[PDB]
């Protein structure tokens, strides 16, 4: 038993929901209690979606104890198929259903539908959202990807992008265009904006761009054997990170690194004279594993901050972090307790925090500038405007986002200082 107010991650079935929603023509059935369909809200309000999530529930209640429950998941799967007619489906258990007898494999097998139905292993008492996302996607790729002959031209897949993904939309956009600048067109971006039909056509692309380790690295791994596909290990957030990502791609493809840097304004901005008081402002960095490693290289090497703290809430990424953190003379902080994060930030005593909605809130409490660099995030951070993190325009966005809270801080200090 852990006393819990804030959580950084949902339970694993959200991660499932998050992958199923990313896809088109795909139905997910969750065995779970009535009243437990709340996650709708996240996809329809926070992401701002126009159709209902492609997710259905068996919606059992108190007066349904007895093997009554297996039969309910059956008719849930039945109904979902009859009604929507999806190229494939996938089935799993909510945390409550995990404590019940009914088996997602056995009921799926018995009933026996026309299309593939994938049963998912979601340990909802030991794992979380991000795992859910990865497994669910591992399992879909594992079931649907087959060896194939490579495209005539050079192509790749974008692995990892999802529903409720923090700037996923626009990162896909921005990566597509920086690949296109090197002659490389995209095969299939998945899970996001992909059908099961498309998931079979995976084999034919030379390499995989692993966009988000946290959401599609298992799938990247599985594809390493299945169709002998090498995934990119360097995630392109920041300029240096992007250059190295492009060089890594040149290494994978043989192709010469071509860049369209005509709109890249961050290096000059940060090189500018108004940027000089940024020099070694102490920043504390918290968030999802991938964005913290990215932020810190920008912070120290592209903006000239002193990274004074570094950590993440997802266990899954603790070693990539602990490694990187050391490089900055720092001991990573792996925690999902925000009360810990609050303790760390007070200890580090930074002048700027970069984190999640929670850190924005701690920062508010402590009267410190702050920017948001990672999920979980509210509606604010699924903007209508174009706002990637990755690549060049992404590097612009990041510089503007992070510098603002600080400029405002100065303007606040000054104005009150001279009020009296």
């Amino acid at each position: 038993m852990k006393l819990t107010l804030w959580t950084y991650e949902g339970p694993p079935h959200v991660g499932a929901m998050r992958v199923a929603t990313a896809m088109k023509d795909l139905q997910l059935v969750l065995h779970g209690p009535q009243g437990c369909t709340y996650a709708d809200l996240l996809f329809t309000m926070i992401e701002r979606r126009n159709a209902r999530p492609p997710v259905s529930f068996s919606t059992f209640e108190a007066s349904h104890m007895g093997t009554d429950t297996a039969i309910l998941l059956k008719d849930a799967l039945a109904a979902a198929h009859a009604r929507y007619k999806p190229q494939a489906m996938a089935v799993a258990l909510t945390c409550t259903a995990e404590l019940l007898q009914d088996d997602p494999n056995g009921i799926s097998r018995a009933l026996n539908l026309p299309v593939p139905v994938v049963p998912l292993e979601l340990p909802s008492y030991s794992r979380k959202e991000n795992y859910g996302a990865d497994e669910t996607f591992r399992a879909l790729v594992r079931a649907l990807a087959v060896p194939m002959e490579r495209t005539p031209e050079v192509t790749c897949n974008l692995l990892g992008a999802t529903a409720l993904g923090f700037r996923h939309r626009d990162d896909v956009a921005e990566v597509t265009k920086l690949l296109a600048t090197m002659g490389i067109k995209v095969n299939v971006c998945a899970p996001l904006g992909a059908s099961p039909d498309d998931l079979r056509k995976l084999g034919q692309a030379h390499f995989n761009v692993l966009m988000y380790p946290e959401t599609g690295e298992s799938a990247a791994r599985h594809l390493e054997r299945a169709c002998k596909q090498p995934f990119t290990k360097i995630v392109p957030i920041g300029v240096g990170a992007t250059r190295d990502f492009l060089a890594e791609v040149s290494k994978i493809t043989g192709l010469p690194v071509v860049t369209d840097e005509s709109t890249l304004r961050q290096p000059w901005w940060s090189a500018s004279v108004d940027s000089t008081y940024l020099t070694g402002k102490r920043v504390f960095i918290f968030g999802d594993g991938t964005h913290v490693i990215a932020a810190a290289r920008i912070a120290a090497k592209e903006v000239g901050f002193e990274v004074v703290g570094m950590g993440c809430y997802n266990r899954e990424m603790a070693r990539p972090l602990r490694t990187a953190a050391a490089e900055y003379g720092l001991e990573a902080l792996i925690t999902d307790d925000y009360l810990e994060v609050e303790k760390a930030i007070e200890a580090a005593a930074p002048e700027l925090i970069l984190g999640t909605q929670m850190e924005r809130n701690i920062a508010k409490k402590l009267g410190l500038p702050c920017a948001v660099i990672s999920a979980p995030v509210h509606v604010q951070d699924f903007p209508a405007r174009y706002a990637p993190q990755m690549g060049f325009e992404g590097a612009n966005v990041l510089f503007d986002t992070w510098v603002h809270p600080l400029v405002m801080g100065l303007e606040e200090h000054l104005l009150t200082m001279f009020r009296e």
């Binding site: 038993m1 852990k2 006393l3 819990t4 107010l5 804030w6 959580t7 991650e9 949902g10 339970p11 079935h13 959200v14 209690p33 009535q34 009243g35 437990c36 369909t37 709340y38 996650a39 709708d40 809200l41 996240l42 996809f43 329809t44 309000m45 701002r48 979606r49 126009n50 159709a51 209902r52 999530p53 259905s56 529930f57 068996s58 919606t59 059992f60 209640e61 108190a62 849930a76 109904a79 009604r83 909510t94 945390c95 409550t96 404590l99 019940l100 340990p123 909802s124 008492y125 030991s126 979380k128 929670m358 809130n361 509210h378």
Partner: protein, 415 residues
Amino acid sequence: TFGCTDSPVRRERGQKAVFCGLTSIVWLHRKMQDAFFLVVGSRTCAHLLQAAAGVMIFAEPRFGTAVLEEQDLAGLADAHKELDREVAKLLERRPDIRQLFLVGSCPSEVLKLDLDRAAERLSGLHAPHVRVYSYTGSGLDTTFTQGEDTCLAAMVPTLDTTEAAELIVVGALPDVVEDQCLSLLTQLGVGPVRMLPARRSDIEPAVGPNTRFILAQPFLGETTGALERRGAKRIAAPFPFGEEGTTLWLKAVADAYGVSAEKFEAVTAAPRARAKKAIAAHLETLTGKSLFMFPDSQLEIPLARFLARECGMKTTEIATPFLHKAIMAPDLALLPSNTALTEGQDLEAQLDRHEAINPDLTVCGLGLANPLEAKGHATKWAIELVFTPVHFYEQAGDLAGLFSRPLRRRALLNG
């Protein structure tokens, strides 16, 4: 054209899109200043509360969830030891808390983890500074606002006993409203009147054989049940929504308490005019418009009753998560006859009814509203209507407001 008592209610089961009773905590905690609601459940439970409390989560709310970990599943004698010491740790970390509620979840109940002994033991260990109760909010027992009921009802058996004949108004209300309510009841001549729940735990109303109580809220079946079992007798009334609602509501207490139409008209006169006028501003956009309501809060009947009667809307399908026949009787009397009633839901059946219905305005949950807006149906998300002040006279305009606005906006967005 105005009466529904003999209408057959579609008693419906199937796939559901509702909130469990846990959600209710999010708004209860506010009214009961002295209390902490400690859910015993899974990370699903925690994440739910998070989603439902939006921004409030950052305001050190006084609720939280003891999230069941993998090693709590087997060995269910640890369960009590684990909780015991997780509770004390919390009761040290916020000493101002006086009522602790062990709110039970689906997980907690599948494990037939008996919260009731736990509630009783903890009460001893932590006496007499903090008294700890227990009730269910598990999706299995409870839909959305039923969580207030199961809560209040659990508190009722332990209230101090009494002789005197005083009014208890049942249902947590926005504070401001509660006062307007107090005020009018006084001016009618109704000596001592209390709220359940109270603002603090030291001013909990007593009950006895001579106590009368009235419902501020439709979703209070069990609490009514428990109060009756203490010998206190209910007062029937349609729920105070609109001028007609509020008036009859007052009228019902007036009658039972022997108050002259004289003192009634002279008290009630000023405020009834206020209301009727404020409401009138919305008639233009609202009269003639057809209304469909999915189930969420048990508020859909009396709200539909106000919308059709005082706003001149046409009720299509009104749907409620539960339908207490005896309690809902006055409002059903006033509801248009042509109205299909649904207890419970089979989402897909319902969505299919509404598709070929094509109503003007459609009242629903947040996971439906947008999908439905993208289809060209106007929506008015329902959750708002628990927490916004909407009862009684002063809020009558604002209430109608809440349903005009979405339509006003729709027109506006294409000429």
